[PDB]
RNA sequence: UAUAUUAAUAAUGUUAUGAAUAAUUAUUAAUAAUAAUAAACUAAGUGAACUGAAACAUCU
RNA sequence: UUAAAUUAAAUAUAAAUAUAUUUAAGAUGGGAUAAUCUAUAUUAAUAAUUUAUCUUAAAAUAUAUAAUUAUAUUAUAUAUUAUAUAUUUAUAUAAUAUAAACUAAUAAAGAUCAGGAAAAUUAAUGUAUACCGUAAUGUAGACCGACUCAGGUAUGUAAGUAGAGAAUAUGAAGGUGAAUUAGAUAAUUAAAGGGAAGGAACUCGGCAAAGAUAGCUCAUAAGUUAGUCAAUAAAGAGUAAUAAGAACAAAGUUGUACAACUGUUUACUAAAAACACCGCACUUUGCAGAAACGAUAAGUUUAAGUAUAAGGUGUGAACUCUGCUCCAUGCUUAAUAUAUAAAUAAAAU
RNA sequence: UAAUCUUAUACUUAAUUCUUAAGUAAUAUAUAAUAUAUAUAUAUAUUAUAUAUUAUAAGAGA
């Protein structure tokens, strides 16, 4: 039985999608800049 | 002593099999080595063998079929023997990281320990030596167990570990039961001709080390793993046949029913699997003198 | 760990022998500090494909 | 494992970057002491893969006539009493004290599949003890499933009675009785219970549903690869039971085809004769290798391995076996036969 | 084979450390002279002059 694909764990989620993860890599930086340009309020977890 | 030796030679290594109470136990067949030590290796001479799963530094399987065997400790074994001086063999152990048995030497002047690959008839209590550092009449030198440059070994003598360069360690004939033979010696060129376990006759530098005798565990060849599980324990994941796949995956893939699809036997990446020589043209073993028997 | 360390001194308590050693406070001097920074425009490197050709590969 | 981080020139690469090497980060693991309660700071000197704890031996208890037979006990875990040594507090000794389970610690030891990595002692001087987590929910109305969703979700304790058990029955204690009720129970549906005479006449097909005469102890053939494999054999017996009388474990024998077998597979229509396999065979590669990956490179996996190894390929345990054929497509060795591409003088029209 | 490639591993002076320059000592190599031993050749010792302080070893090698 599918449907329950997101299996929350705070550690994994901060480590993968978190602000610090984004800011550490060049690709991540691009993403953050993109979100800033769009004016998103929340740049990442 | 001679009589004892003869007796030992006569005595064959028995092949243990359990009662076939399970269908997998039916074909498990292992050689017994009772003189082979029971216990552990010296922790100061082992390092963890870190499992790769056959994955390269890309994270991608580069070599198929490697996988999750038992945990394993690598034994640092001396393929060099730069020490010199007598050494008493304390015990002969099982090494999971190779097919040969290993021998734990204690050097007598110092009490310092080292592992060697075990020669065929080597036993605990025996004494061996190394002659990399020259000699300090002749036949006492040449006897199963001791290493020396090829320059010092009589022509025709069977040897196992064989270096390539003088400064270098023994690269050839280290697996269970294997051995090479010195065919000729040429001082003027500084080369000797060795025939390796395959049958190729190859040039090797004169000062290159070799240890006399045949590699131990000659009966390793005959061991029959009885069940799939045993392979898995050895870190060997299953191989899937090209013919059982689809064309996207293998040249042999597809077809309704089993069929080779009139396609020459080849690898998943298309190179030919029967006969096609892979080292070819310019790149080739210069020191090849006489080639291996078949191809 | 700049309510930092080092040096110099000043009052203070202890020890061993007016001189010597360590502890705390207070003044003076010396010694480093902090990449939040646009976007479009310009130049350069690499450089598709869909598409058009009423097919397609030269071409586009 | 990760890291625009770190070596005129670390190495490689259209850029992005990639690589080995150092440095730092990184728990799911390791980390002094301690109710006869305990002090981590500063300065100076020179572990453990799994698994079992049998047999023997010792001493103890009863029969019989030191020695035999039968039985239980046998490494550790406290309290009480009585003793000898420092002086009621200490040390050691002796005697007394249930069962079957469990825990931890101890020692010894069998198997092959051979079993983590990383941060010293003494002396002197010290200590005012930081920060954060802490509700409740957590086999669920409090998480993941669009819903207060019969799904998914990790660990420990899990009263007794009974029994081989965490089976099955009950349930002491605790918890719960719910965002639908009340009646009525037609036809009809679902989930059950029973059924005379028949007993597969049903049906594609005994599908479904019946069907268990000990779960302990004996006893168990043919066949066979010699493995109580077949076997939990069928049948049959012992104890229990004489027609009234819990629940759960336990549902037959034989032939053939296919596949040796335990396994794996189409998450959500296919579990198989398909994949895998152990074994068999062929082959490439001598290590400055072969194979794979690498805008391609350095370089990685191969491997701290070295031909009884490693890569690839077919077949797929074992028993009896594997006939004939290189025409063709390849590979492979040998030459001579023999053409051609780019690349050159200097010199002729 | 000093093509290419592979692998392993002291003082003085001048602008606390760094760099230059001079000389002297130390070690190595090359050339020259003298003395001795052996069969024009080889070996050792002494003296003079020049050069060096990425290396060494191993391997492949036009
Ligand atoms: Mg969703
Ligand atoms: Mg990632
Ligand atoms: Mg298929
Ligand atoms: Mg067919
Ligand atoms: Mg441009
Ligand atoms: Mg750390
Ligand atoms: Mg629910
Ligand atoms: Mg009918
Ligand atoms: Mg019918
Ligand atoms: Mg049942
Ligand atoms: Mg099957
Ligand atoms: Mg199904
Ligand atoms: Mg077969
Ligand atoms: Mg093979
Ligand atoms: Mg097949
Ligand atoms: Na095929």
From Swiss-Prot, chain A:
<comment type="function">
    <text>Component of the mitochondrial ribosome (mitoribosome), a dedicated translation machinery responsible for the synthesis of mitochondrial genome-encoded proteins, including at least some of the essential transmembrane subunits of the mitochondrial respiratory chain. The mitoribosomes are attached to the mitochondrial inner membrane and translation products are cotranslationally integrated into the membrane.</text>
</comment>
<comment type="subunit">
    <text>Component of the mitochondrial large ribosomal subunit (mt-LSU). Mature yeast 74S mitochondrial ribosomes consist of a small (37S) and a large (54S) subunit. The 37S small subunit contains a 15S ribosomal RNA (15S mt-rRNA) and 34 different proteins. The 54S large subunit contains a 21S rRNA (21S mt-rRNA) and 46 different proteins.</text>
</comment>
<protein>
    <recommendedName>
        <fullName>Large ribosomal subunit protein bL34m</fullName>
    </recommendedName>
</protein>
<comment type="similarity">
    <text>Belongs to the bacterial ribosomal protein bL34 family.</text>
</comment>
Curated annotation (Swiss-Prot), chain B:
<dbReference type="GO" id="GO:0005739">
    <property type="term" value="C:mitochondrion"/>
</dbReference>
<comment type="function">
    <text>Component of the mitochondrial ribosome (mitoribosome), a dedicated translation machinery responsible for the synthesis of mitochondrial genome-encoded proteins, including at least some of the essential transmembrane subunits of the mitochondrial respiratory chain. The mitoribosomes are attached to the mitochondrial inner membrane and translation products are cotranslationally integrated into the membrane.</text>
</comment>
<keyword id="KW-0496">Mitochondrion</keyword>
<keyword id="KW-0689">Ribosomal protein</keyword>
<dbReference type="GO" id="GO:0005743">
    <property type="term" value="C:mitochondrial inner membrane"/>
</dbReference>
<dbReference type="GO" id="GO:0005762">
    <property type="term" value="C:mitochondrial large ribosomal subunit"/>
</dbReference>
<comment type="subunit">
    <text>Component of the mitochondrial large ribosomal subunit (mt-LSU). Mature yeast 74S mitochondrial ribosomes consist of a small (37S) and a large (54S) subunit. The 37S small subunit contains a 15S ribosomal RNA (15S mt-rRNA) and 34 different proteins. The 54S large subunit contains a 21S rRNA (21S mt-rRNA) and 46 different proteins. uL2m has a Na/K ligand binding site.</text>
</comment>
<keyword id="KW-0809">Transit peptide</keyword>
<dbReference type="GO" id="GO:0003723">
    <property type="term" value="F:RNA binding"/>
</dbReference>
<feature type="region of interest" description="Disordered">
    <location>
        <begin position="244"/>
        <end position="295"/>
    </location>
</feature>
<dbReference type="GO" id="GO:0032543">
    <property type="term" value="P:mitochondrial translation"/>
</dbReference>
<dbReference type="GO" id="GO:0003735">
    <property type="term" value="F:structural constituent of ribosome"/>
</dbReference>
<protein>
    <recommendedName>
        <fullName>Large ribosomal subunit protein uL2m</fullName>
    </recommendedName>
</protein>
<dbReference type="GO" id="GO:0016740">
    <property type="term" value="F:transferase activity"/>
</dbReference>
<feature type="compositionally biased region" description="Basic residues">
    <location>
        <begin position="276"/>
        <end position="287"/>
    </location>
</feature>
<feature type="compositionally biased region" description="Basic and acidic residues">
    <location>
        <begin position="288"/>
        <end position="295"/>
    </location>
</feature>
<comment type="similarity">
    <text>Belongs to the universal ribosomal protein uL2 family.</text>
</comment>
<keyword id="KW-0687">Ribonucleoprotein</keyword>
């Amino acid at each position: 039985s599918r449907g329950n694909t997101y299996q929350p764990s705070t550690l994994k989620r901060k480590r993968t999608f978190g602000f610090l993860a984004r800011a550490k890599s060049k690709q991540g930086s691009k993403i953050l800049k993109r979100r800033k340009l769009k004016g998103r309020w929340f740049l990442s977890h | 002593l001679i009589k004892r030796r003869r007796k030992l030679s006569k005595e064959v290594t028995q092949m243990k099999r359990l009662k076939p109470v399970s269908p997998g136990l039916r074909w498990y067949r292992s050689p017994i080595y009772p003189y082979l030590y029971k216990g552990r290796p010296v922790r100061a001479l082992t390092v963890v063998r870190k499992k790769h799963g056959g994955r390269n530094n890309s994270g991608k399987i580069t070599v198929r079929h490697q996988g999750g065997g038992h945990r394993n400790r690598t034994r640092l074994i001396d393929f060099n023997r730069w020490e010199g001086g007598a050494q008493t063999v304390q015990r002969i152990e099982y090494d999971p990281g190779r097919s040969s048995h290993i021998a734990l030497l204690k050097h007598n002047t110092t009490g310092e320990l080292s592992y060697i690959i075990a020669c065929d008839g080597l036993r605990p209590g025996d004494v061996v030596e190394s002659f990399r550092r020259g000699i300090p009449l002749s036949v006492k030198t040449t006897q199963r167990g001791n290493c020396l440059p090829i320059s010092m070994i009589p022509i025709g003598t069977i040897i196992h570990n064989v270096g390539i360069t003088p400064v270098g360690p023994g690269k050839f004939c280290r697996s269970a039961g294997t051995y090479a033979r010195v065919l000729a010696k040429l001082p003027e060129k500084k080369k000797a001709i060795v025939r390796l376990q395959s049958g190729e006759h190859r040039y090797v530098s004169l000062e290159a080390v070799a240890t006399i005798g045949v590699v131990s565990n000659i009966d390793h060849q005959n061991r029959s793993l009885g069940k799939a599980g045993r392979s898995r324990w050895l870190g060997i994941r299953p191989t899937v046949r090209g013919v059982a796949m689809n064309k996207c995956d293998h040249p042999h893939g597809g077809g309704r029913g089993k069929s080779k699809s009139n396609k020459l036997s080849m690898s998943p990446w298309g190179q030919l699997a029967k006969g096609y020589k892979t080292r070819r043209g310019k790149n080739q073993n210069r020191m090849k003198v006489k080639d291996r028997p078949r191809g």
